[PDB]
CSV table of C-alpha atoms and ligand atoms in Angstrom, one decimal:
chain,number,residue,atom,x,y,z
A,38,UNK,CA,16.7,-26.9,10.0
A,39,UNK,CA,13.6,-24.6,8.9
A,40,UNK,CA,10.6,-24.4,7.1
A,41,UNK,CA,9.6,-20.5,5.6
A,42,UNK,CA,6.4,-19.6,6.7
A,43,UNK,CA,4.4,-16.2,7.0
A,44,UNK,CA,2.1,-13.9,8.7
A,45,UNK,CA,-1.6,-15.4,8.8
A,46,UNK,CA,-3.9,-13.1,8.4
A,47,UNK,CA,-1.3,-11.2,6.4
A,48,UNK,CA,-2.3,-7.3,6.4
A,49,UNK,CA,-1.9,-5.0,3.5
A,50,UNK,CA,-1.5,-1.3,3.9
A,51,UNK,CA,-2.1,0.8,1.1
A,52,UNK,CA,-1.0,4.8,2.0
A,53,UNK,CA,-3.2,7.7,0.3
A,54,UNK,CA,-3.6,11.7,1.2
A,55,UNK,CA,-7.0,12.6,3.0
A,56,UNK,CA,-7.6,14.5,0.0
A,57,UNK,CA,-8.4,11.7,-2.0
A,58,UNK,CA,-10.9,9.8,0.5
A,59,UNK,CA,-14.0,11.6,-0.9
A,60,UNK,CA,-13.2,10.4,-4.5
A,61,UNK,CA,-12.7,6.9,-3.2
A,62,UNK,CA,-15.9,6.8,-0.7
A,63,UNK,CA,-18.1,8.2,-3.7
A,64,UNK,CA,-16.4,5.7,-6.3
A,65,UNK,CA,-16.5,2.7,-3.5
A,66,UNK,CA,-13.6,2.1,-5.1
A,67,UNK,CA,-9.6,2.9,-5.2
A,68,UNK,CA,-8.6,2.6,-9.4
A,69,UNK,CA,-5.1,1.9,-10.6
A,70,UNK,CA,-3.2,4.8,-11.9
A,71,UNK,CA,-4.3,3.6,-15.3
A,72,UNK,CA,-7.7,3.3,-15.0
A,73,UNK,CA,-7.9,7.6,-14.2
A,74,UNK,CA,-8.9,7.7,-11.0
A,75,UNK,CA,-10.5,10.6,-9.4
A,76,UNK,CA,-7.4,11.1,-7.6
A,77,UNK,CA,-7.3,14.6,-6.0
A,78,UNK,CA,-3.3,14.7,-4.7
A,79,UNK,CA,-0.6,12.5,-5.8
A,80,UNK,CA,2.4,12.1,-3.0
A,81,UNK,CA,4.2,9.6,-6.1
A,82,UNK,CA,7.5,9.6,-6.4
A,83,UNK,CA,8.0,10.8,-10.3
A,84,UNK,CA,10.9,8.1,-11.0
A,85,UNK,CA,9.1,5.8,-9.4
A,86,UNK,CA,6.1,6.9,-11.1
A,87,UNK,CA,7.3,6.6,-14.6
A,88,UNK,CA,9.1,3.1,-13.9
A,89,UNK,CA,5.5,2.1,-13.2
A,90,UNK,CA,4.3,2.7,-16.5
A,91,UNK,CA,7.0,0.0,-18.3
A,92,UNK,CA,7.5,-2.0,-15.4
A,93,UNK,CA,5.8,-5.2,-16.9
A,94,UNK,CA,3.6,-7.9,-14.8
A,95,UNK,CA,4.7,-11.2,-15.6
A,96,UNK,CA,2.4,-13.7,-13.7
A,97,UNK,CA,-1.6,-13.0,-15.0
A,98,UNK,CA,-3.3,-11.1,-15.6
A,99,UNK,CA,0.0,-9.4,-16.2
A,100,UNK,CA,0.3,-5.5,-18.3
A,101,UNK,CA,2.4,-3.2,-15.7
A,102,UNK,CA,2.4,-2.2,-12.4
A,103,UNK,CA,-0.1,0.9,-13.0
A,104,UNK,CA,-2.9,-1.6,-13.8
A,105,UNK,CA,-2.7,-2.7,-10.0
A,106,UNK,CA,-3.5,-0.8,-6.7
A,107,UNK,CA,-0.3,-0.9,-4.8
A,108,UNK,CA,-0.2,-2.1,-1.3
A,109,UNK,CA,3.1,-2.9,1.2
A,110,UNK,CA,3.1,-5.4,3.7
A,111,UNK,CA,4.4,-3.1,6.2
A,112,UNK,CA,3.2,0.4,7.4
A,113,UNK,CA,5.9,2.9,8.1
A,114,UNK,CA,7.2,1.7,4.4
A,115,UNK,CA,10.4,3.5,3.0
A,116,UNK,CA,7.4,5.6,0.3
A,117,UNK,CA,6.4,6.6,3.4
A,118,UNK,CA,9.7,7.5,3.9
A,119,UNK,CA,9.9,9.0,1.0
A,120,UNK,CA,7.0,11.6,1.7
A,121,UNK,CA,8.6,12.5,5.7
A,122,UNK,CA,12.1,13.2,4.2
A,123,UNK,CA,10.5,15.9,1.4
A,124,UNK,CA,12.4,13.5,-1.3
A,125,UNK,CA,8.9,13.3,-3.2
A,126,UNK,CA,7.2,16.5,-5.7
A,127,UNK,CA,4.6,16.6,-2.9
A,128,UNK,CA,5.6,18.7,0.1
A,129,UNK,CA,3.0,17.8,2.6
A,130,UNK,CA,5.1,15.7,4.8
A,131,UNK,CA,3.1,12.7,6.2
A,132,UNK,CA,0.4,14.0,8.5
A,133,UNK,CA,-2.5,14.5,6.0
A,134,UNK,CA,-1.6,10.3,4.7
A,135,UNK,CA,-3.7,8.0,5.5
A,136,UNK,CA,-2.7,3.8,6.0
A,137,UNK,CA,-5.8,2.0,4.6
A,138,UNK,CA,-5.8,-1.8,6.1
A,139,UNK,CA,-6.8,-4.7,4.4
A,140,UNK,CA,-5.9,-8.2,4.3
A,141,UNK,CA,-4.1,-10.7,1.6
A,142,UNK,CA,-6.8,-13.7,2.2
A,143,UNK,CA,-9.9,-11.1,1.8
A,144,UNK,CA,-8.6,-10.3,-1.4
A,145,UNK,CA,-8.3,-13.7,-2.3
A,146,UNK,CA,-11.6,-14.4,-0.8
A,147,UNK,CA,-13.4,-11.7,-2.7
A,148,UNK,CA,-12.3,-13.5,-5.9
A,149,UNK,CA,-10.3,-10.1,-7.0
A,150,UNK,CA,-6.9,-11.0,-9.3
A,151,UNK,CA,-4.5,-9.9,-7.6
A,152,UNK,CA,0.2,-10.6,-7.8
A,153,UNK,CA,2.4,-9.7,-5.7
A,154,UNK,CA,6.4,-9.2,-5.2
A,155,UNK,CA,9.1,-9.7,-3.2
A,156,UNK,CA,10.7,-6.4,-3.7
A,157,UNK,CA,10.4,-2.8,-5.3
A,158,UNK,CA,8.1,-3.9,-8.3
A,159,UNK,CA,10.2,-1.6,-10.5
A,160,UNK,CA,13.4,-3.6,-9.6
A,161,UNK,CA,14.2,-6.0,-12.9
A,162,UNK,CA,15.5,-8.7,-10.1
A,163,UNK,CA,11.6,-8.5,-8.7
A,164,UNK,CA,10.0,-12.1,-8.3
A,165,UNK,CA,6.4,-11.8,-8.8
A,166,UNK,CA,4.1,-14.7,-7.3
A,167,UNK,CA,-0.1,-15.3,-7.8
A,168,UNK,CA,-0.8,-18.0,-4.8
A,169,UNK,CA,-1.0,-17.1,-0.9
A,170,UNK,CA,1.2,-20.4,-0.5
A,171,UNK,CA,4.1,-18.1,-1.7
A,172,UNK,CA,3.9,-15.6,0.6
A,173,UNK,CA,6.6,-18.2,2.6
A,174,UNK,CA,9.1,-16.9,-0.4
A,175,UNK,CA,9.4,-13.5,0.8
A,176,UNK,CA,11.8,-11.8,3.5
A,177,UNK,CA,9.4,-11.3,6.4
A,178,UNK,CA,12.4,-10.4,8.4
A,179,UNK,CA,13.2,-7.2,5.9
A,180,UNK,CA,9.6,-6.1,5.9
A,181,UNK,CA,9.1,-6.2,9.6
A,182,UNK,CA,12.1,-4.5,10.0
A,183,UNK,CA,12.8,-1.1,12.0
A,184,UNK,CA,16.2,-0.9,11.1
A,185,UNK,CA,16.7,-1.2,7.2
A,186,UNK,CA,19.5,1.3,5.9
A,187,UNK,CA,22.2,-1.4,5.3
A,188,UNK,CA,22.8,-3.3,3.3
A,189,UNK,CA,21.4,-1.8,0.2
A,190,UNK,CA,19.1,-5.0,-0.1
A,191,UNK,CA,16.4,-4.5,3.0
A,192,UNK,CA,15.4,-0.9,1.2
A,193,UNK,CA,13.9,-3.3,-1.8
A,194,UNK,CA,12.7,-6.1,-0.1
A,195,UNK,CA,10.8,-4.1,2.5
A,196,UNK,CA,8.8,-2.5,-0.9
A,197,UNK,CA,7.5,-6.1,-1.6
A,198,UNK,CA,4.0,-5.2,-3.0
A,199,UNK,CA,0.8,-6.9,-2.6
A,200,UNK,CA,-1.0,-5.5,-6.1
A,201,UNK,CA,-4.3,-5.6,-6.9
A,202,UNK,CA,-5.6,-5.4,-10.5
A,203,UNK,CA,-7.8,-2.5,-12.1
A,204,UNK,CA,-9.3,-1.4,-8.7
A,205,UNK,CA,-9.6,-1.9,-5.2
A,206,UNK,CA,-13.4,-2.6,-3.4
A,207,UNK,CA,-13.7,0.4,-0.7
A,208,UNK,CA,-15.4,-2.3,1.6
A,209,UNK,CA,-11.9,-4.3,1.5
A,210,UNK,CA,-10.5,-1.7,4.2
A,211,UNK,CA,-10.8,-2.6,8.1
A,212,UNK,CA,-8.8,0.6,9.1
A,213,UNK,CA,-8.1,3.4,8.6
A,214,UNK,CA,-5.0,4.5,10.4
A,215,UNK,CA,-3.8,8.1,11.0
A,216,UNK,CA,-0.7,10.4,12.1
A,217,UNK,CA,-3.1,12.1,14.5
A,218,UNK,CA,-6.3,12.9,16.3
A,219,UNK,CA,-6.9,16.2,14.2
A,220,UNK,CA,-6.5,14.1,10.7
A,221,UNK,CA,-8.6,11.5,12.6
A,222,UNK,CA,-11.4,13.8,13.1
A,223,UNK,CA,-11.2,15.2,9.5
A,224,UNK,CA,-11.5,11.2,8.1
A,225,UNK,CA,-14.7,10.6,10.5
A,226,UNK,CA,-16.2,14.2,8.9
A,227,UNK,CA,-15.9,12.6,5.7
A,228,UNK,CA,-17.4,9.2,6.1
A,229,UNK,CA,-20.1,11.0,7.4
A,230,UNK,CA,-20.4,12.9,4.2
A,231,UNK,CA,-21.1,9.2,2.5
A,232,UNK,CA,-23.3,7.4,4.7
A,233,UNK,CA,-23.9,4.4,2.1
A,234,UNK,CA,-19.9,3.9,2.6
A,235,UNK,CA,-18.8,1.4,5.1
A,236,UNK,CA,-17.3,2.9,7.8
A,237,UNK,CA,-14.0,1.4,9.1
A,238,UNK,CA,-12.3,1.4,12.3
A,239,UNK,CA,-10.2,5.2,12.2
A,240,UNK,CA,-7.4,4.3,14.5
A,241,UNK,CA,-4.4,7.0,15.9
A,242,UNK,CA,-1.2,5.2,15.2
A,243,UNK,CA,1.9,7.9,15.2
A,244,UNK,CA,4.3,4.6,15.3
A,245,UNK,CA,3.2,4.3,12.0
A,246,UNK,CA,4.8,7.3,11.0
A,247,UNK,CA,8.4,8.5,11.1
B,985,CL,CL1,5.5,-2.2,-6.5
C-alpha cells in the first residue's frame, strides 16, 4: 500500500561545455537549439540530435523537442555517458562539461512554460506531463539510480527531461558544478569577465562524473 510521491525541491541539471558559458553569460540566457543560439561547441549526440528536430511536443505549448532547453533530473545522466565513453562527434571527454543547477518549482515560479517527460523525449512510448503534481508519475527509482544497464528500460527512464521552452533565464542557475578545480578556476575567470551576470555557487563534484 503506497502513494507516488517526489523529490521537493526537485533539481534540474542541464550539462553544457565551458566553451559556451561566455555566449550564455552575455545573452543571460541559454536558447533552444531552434532559436540559434550562440552556441560555441556542441557535445550532441547526432541521432539524438536529429530525432529532436521531429520528435513532436504534445502537451502546450507543444512544436518539438528543439524548441525547449533540455534538462535531466539526474547528474551523472547516460548523455553524460555518452560524452565519457567517446560515443558522441565531440571528443573532449567530460572534463571541460559543465552541470548547471536549477530547480523545477523556480521554473514554475518564474512563470516560464515549461513540459516534461518520463523518458528519452525521442522515445514514441515518452509520456509528456505540464503540472509539478505529475512529477509523482515518473520512476524516481531509475533516475536516482547508480546502477542502470539492465534491463533495457532504466537507460530511458533515467533521460526523463525537464524542458523548458524557447530559452532558459541565466539567473535560473544556483550551481554550477565541475569535474575539477582547474575547470573550476576557468568558470570563475569567466564570470568575472561579465560582472552584470549573477554569479552562482561553482562547486567541485567529480561524483558527478564517470
Ligand atoms: Cl529529451
Amino acid at each position: 500500500s503506497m502513494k507516488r510521491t517526489y523529490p521537493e525541491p526537485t533539481p534540474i541539471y542541464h550539462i553544457t561545455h565551458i566553451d559556451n558559458l561566455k555566449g550564455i553569460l552575455r545573452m543571460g540566457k541559454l536558447l533552444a537549439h531552434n532559436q540559434s543560439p550562440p552556441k560555441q561547441r556542441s557535445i550532441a549526440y547526432a541521432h539524438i540530435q536529429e530525432r529532436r528536430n521531429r520528435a513532436k511536443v504534445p502537451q502546450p505549448p507543444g512544436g518539438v523537442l528543439h524548441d525547449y532547453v533540455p534538462f535531466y533530473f539526474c547528474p551523472r545522466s547516460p548523455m553524460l555517458y555518452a560524452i565519457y565513453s567517446g560515443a558522441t562527434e565531440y571528443q573532449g571527454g567530460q572534463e571541460p562539461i559543465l552541470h548547471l543547477v536549477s530547480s523545477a518549482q523556480a521554473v514554475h515560479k518564474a512563470g516560464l512554460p515549461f513540459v516534461f517527460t518520463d523518458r528519452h523525449g525521442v522515445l514514441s512510448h515518452a509520456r509528456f506531463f505540464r503540472q509539478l503534481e505529475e512529477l509523482a508519475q515518473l520512476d524516481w527509482e531509475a533516475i536516482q539510480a547508480s546502477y542502470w544497464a539492465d534491463p533495457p528500460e532504466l537507460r530511458e527512464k533515467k533521460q526523463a527531461a525537464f524542458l523548458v521552452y524557447k530559452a532558459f533565464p541565466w539567473a535560473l542557475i544556483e550551481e554550477i558544478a565541475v569535474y575539477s578545480q582547474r575547470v573550476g578556476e576557468e568558470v570563475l575567470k569567466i564570470l568575472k569577465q561579465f560582472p552584470e551576470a549573477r554569479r552562482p555557487r561553482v562547486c567541485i563534484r567529480k561524483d558527478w562524473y564517470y
